[PDB]
Amino acid sequence: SDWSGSVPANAENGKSTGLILKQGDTISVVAHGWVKYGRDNVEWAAPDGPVPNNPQPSSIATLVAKIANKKFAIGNGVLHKTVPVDGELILLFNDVPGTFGDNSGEFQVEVIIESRYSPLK
Amino acid sequence: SDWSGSVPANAENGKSTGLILKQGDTISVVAHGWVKYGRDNVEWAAPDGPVPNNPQPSSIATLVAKIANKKFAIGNGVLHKTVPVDGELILLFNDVPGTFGDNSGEFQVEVIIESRYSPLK
Amino acid sequence: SDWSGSVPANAENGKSTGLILKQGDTISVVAHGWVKYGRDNVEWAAPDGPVPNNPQPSSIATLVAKIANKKFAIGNGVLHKTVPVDGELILLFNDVPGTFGDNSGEFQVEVIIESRYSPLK
Amino acid sequence: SDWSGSVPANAENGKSTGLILKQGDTISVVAHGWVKYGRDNVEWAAPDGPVPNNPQPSSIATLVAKIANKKFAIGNGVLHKTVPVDGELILLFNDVPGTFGDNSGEFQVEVIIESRYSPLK
Ligand SMILES: CO[C@H]1O[C@H](CO)[C@H](O)[C@H](O)[C@H]1O
Ligand SMILES: CO[C@H]1O[C@H](CO)[C@H](O)[C@H](O)[C@H]1O
Ligand SMILES: CO[C@H]1O[C@H](CO)[C@H](O)[C@H](O)[C@H]1O
Ligand SMILES: CO[C@H]1O[C@H](CO)[C@H](O)[C@H](O)[C@H]1O
Ligand SMILES: [Ca+2]
Ligand SMILES: [Ca+2]
Ligand SMILES: [Ca+2]
Ligand SMILES: [Ca+2]
């Protein structure tokens, strides 16, 4: 993969990948593992989000991509998706701001840059 | 995607994709969603497997690929993996045989054939 | 390949690949072989164009892609290029209109649809 | 691209790309341009080989890939081909040994490592 690493659930600023994406690039992502978004026995989340026996608001406690401070859904993974903005790829466990203190665990994530933007001319 | 569809947790024989894979092909898979592998409130599973607060034996209640009656790990997804055997791709919720009766729900899965085998000559 | 076939040099309307493309798709192409754009011994062309010892105007007697009646350079090939317009992919030996009658031969061309447009959201 | 650069026709040892390939990787290549394999006005070659109005023996004056001192056809390009041996990718204008002194020009070549070997398990 172009980047592989952990995404800690307690990282409020996310995990920086160092991948500098440009508008028009395409990427794929797969995310593995489990994290806690709280201390309770039920407050587990996959990258796709909280276990549905304790659901949270939309996009909360899911794996998202942050690019130029805009957030995009990733969850368990995405295949060959076009990047609409420039910026470094930050992978973020999208917990409510200020509530990362009771989080633990990390996802294992792989990112592939499938293509760099170049149009037909 | 080359194939997108549901993989029911209660399907003991899995979900046939119709994709005929050859040794040397490469594929990518991403799987989303939640299933129950039992009627208890804790018996939830992501494609990666059971929620860790109620763990099961290795590979049980995970999403796997069946090709020529061999099983391969898939879970939440894989990127650009080489197919080692010829056969139709079957996607299977790998519950213990005979225990699919209390399963429910389905994963949403996407499969892409990234390349068909062709060697440098 | 998603499409493989011969592109005749004397086909003033090009060769249909049957591939229906959408803006934002990415494609790769490789083209092999040799054609004649005239009866003279010097009037050979690779997909990239005429041999430089008998140059023709820009883009003339080169392999191009025709989509929605717009022309894009292909030549010997392109890798993971973004498609800017919807339409059927036509491959065309871009000879001067009305001068296809003295052409002969065909390029062997392979086309791969690397991805179908799907943005991060 | 993973590597893009020039392949001089007069480089008897070829052009080292620095790409370290492993058995099972897949690669794509496209090659553009024209070179001379001799001082005569007719001794032009595309990556696919000599212009057919002055043909040479089979495989001579064609663009090939050298991996572990073995030669593989490339010509104008290849798409998603599996690498059969470990080694650095060397791109070579395959002229007769000792006859590179009368060559000039260079091909413009792009190489993409489409995937790094990882099997389903
Ligand atoms: C409802 O509380 C739980 O979920 C929220 C997010 O909605 C926070 O993560 C909090 O730490 C956790 O205990
Ligand atoms: C421990 O029981 C639970 O898990 C097993 C597999 O380990 C079966 O799926 C069963 O249906 C479910 O109730
Ligand atoms: C100089 O003429 C040559 O090139 C032109 C295109 O410019 C036509 O293909 C013509 O048939 C061919 O003989
Ligand atoms: C027949 O001569 C020509 O072709 C051979 C290879 O076949 C050599 O490249 C030589 O330099 C060139 O002049
Ligand atoms: Ca929290
Ligand atoms: Ca069960
Ligand atoms: Ca002509
Ligand atoms: Ca020579």
Side-chain angles (χ1 to χ4, degrees):
Chain A
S1 60
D2 283 297
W3 181 90
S4 57
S6 67
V7 179
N10 73 349
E12 184 156 11
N13 201 16
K15 173 63 146 151
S16 298
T17 71
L19 301 178
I20 309 306
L21 305 178
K22 312 311 199 185
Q23 177 173 20
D25 295 349
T26 69
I27 64 170
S28 300
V29 183
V30 294
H32 297 283
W34 300 94
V35 305
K36 296 263 282 170
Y37 62 95
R39 305 285 256 286
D40 192 297
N41 177 68
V42 72
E43 290 173 307
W44 288 89
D48 249 26
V51 183
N53 58 7
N54 195 65
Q56 302 300 317
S58 180
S59 81
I60 296 296
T62 72
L63 179 62
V64 303
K66 270 208 308 187
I67 309 174
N69 216 25
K70 190 121 192 291
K71 289 177 181 177
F72 304 94
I74 295 292
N76 291 347
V78 303
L79 297 177
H80 296 260
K81 303 302 187 180
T82 300
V83 182
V85 295
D86 299 333
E88 176 181 9
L89 172 58
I90 311 302
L91 293 165
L92 172 65
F93 182 65
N94 192 40
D95 205 354
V96 171
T99 71
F100 286 76
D102 57 1
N103 298 4
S104 60
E106 63 187 27
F107 296 129
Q108 279 58 228
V109 185
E110 308 181 10
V111 179
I112 289 178
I113 298 173
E114 299 282 8
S115 61
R116 296 295 199 167
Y117 179 62
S118 185
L120 287 179
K121 248 101 85 320
Chain B
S1 61
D2 279 292
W3 182 92
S4 59
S6 62
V7 182
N10 70 6
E12 185 155 15
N13 201 30
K15 177 64 123 163
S16 303
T17 67
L19 302 177
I20 311 306
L21 303 177
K22 309 306 191 195
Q23 182 180 6
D25 297 352
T26 69
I27 64 167
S28 292
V29 185
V30 293
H32 298 282
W34 297 98
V35 304
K36 295 276 279 182
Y37 63 93
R39 306 281 266 285
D40 191 292
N41 180 64
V42 72
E43 290 175 309
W44 289 89
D48 254 24
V51 185
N53 61 2
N54 197 65
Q56 304 303 317
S58 177
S59 81
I60 299 301
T62 73
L63 180 65
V64 303
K66 257 208 313 185
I67 310 173
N69 207 41
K70 181 164 207 321
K71 288 180 197 167
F72 304 95
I74 294 293
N76 292 348
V78 301
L79 298 178
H80 295 258
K81 303 301 186 178
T82 300
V83 179
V85 296
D86 294 355
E88 176 180 18
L89 173 61
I90 315 303
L91 298 169
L92 172 68
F93 184 63
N94 194 42
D95 208 353
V96 173
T99 74
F100 286 78
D102 55 0
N103 295 5
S104 61
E106 54 185 15
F107 299 129
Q108 277 51 231
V109 185
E110 298 178 21
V111 178
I112 292 176
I113 298 173
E114 301 282 9
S115 62
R116 295 295 198 168
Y117 179 65
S118 182
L120 284 175
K121 278 172 176 159
Chain C
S1 64
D2 283 303
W3 183 88
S4 59
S6 63
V7 180
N10 72 349
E12 185 158 15
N13 257 38
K15 175 69 183 177
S16 293
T17 72
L19 301 176
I20 314 312
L21 304 178
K22 306 294 189 201
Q23 183 179 346
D25 297 344
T26 66
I27 63 167
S28 296
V29 186
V30 294
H32 295 282
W34 302 92
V35 304
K36 292 265 277 172
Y37 62 96
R39 301 279 263 276
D40 190 300
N41 172 77
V42 71
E43 296 172 310
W44 288 94
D48 254 24
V51 182
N53 58 8
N54 197 48
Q56 304 301 133
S58 177
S59 85
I60 298 300
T62 76
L63 177 64
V64 302
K66 277 208 309 181
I67 314 172
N69 207 29
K70 186 164 187 316
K71 293 186 189 171
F72 307 92
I74 295 294
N76 291 349
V78 303
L79 295 179
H80 295 262
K81 302 297 188 183
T82 300
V83 178
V85 298
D86 294 357
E88 177 185 335
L89 172 59
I90 307 300
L91 297 167
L92 171 64
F93 185 61
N94 192 40
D95 209 356
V96 169
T99 67
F100 285 77
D102 58 2
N103 295 3
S104 56
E106 33 252 65
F107 297 132
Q108 276 47 247
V109 181
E110 304 180 15
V111 180
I112 290 176
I113 300 171
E114 301 284 6
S115 60
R116 297 294 197 163
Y117 180 63
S118 183
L120 287 175
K121 285 220 175 307
Chain D
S1 63
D2 286 291
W3 181 92
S4 66
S6 63
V7 177
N10 67 11
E12 184 156 8
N13 196 17
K15 174 59 151 176
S16 295
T17 71
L19 301 175
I20 310 307
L21 305 183
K22 302 296 187 188
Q23 183 177 339
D25 297 355
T26 65
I27 67 173
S28 297
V29 185
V30 291
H32 300 281
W34 300 93
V35 303
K36 291 261 281 181
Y37 61 91
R39 288 278 257 278
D40 191 302
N41 174 70
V42 75
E43 289 172 308
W44 288 92
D48 256 27
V51 182
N53 59 357
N54 197 71
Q56 301 301 309
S58 184
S59 76
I60 301 303
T62 68
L63 177 63
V64 300
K66 274 207 316 188
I67 310 171
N69 212 42
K70 177 162 190 348
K71 297 180 183 177
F72 306 91
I74 296 293
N76 293 351
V78 299
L79 297 177
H80 299 258
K81 300 304 186 190
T82 302
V83 177
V85 300
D86 300 341
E88 174 179 8
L89 175 61
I90 310 304
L91 295 166
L92 172 69
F93 184 62
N94 193 40
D95 206 352
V96 174
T99 69
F100 286 78
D102 60 356
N103 301 350
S104 58
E106 59 193 22
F107 297 130
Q108 288 68 49
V109 183
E110 310 174 15
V111 182
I112 293 174
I113 300 176
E114 298 284 3
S115 64
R116 296 294 203 167
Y117 179 64
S118 184
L120 292 171
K121 305 193 157 139

